[PDB]
Amino acid sequence: NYDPFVRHSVTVKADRKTAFKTFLEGFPEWWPNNFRTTKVGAPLGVDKKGGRWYEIDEQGEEHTFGLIRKVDEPDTLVIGWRLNGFGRIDPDNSSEFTVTFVADGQKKTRVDVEHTHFDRMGTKHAKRVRNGMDKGWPTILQSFQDKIDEEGAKK
Fold first, then answer.
1. What CA–CA distances, in Å, run from 37 to 11, 41, 56, 58, 152?
2. How far is Cα 110 from Cα 102, in angstroms, rounded to an integer?
3. CB 140 within 8 A of CB 147
4. How far, CA to CA in Å, does 11 sit from each of 50, 54, 112, 127?
5. What is the rounded CA–CA span in Å between residue 54 and residue 26?
6. CA 107 to the chain's CA centroid
């Protein structure tokens, strides 16, 4: 991905409702990278009323934030990139990925994320992305589907 286009696809075990919940409404409460404090797992994570991904930073609530331009219910989320591992550099502006949750009636949901702007824009752009995405974002998706599995049929 990212060189041509970057796409995220996960399979949710309990409908688009839980996919959206676990992706937006619950940012820092699952089991991935989002469990570390002031990294991506402080008592906040995502702001529903304003539309941005950020946590309460220890220095004074001044965290890099995910640029939500569209919060379209449990369906689609168009957000610009922020930062994951807290050990990486990102512009906190462009990137932009359209999160498309494709609902499966049997309480299943395949999300297909179209991401194309910042990372695609060449070696160094994608290189600064890889600086801390590699052990975060893909891993987020794992624990993401895993806690969703809990909400669905793990228990």
1. 27, 5, 9, 9, 27
2. 5
3. no
4. 28, 25, 9, 28
5. 12
6. 21
What does the alpha-carbon distance between residue 70 and residue 83 come to, in Å, rounded to a whole number? 19
In the block, tokens 């402080």 appear at: 42
Closest listed residue to residue 83, CA positions, set 130, 23, 15: 130
Fold type of domain 1-155 = Alpha-D-Glucose-1,6-Bisphosphate; Chain A, domain 4 (3.30.530)
DSSP annotation of 144 reads H
Indicate the Cα dihedral angle 29, 33, 37, 38, nearest 10°. Answer: -110
Q: Do 119 and 143 form a contact (C-beta atoms < 8 A)?
A: no
Structure tokens, 93: 């502006």
Cα 76 from Cα 101, distance rounded (Å): 6
How far apart (Å, rounded) are the C-alpha atoms in residues 64 and 8? 22
Is residue 126 within 8 Å of 2, Cβ to Cβ? yes
d(CA 148, CA 12): 7
Q: Which of 92, 98, 93, 95 is nearest to 78 (CA)?
A: 98
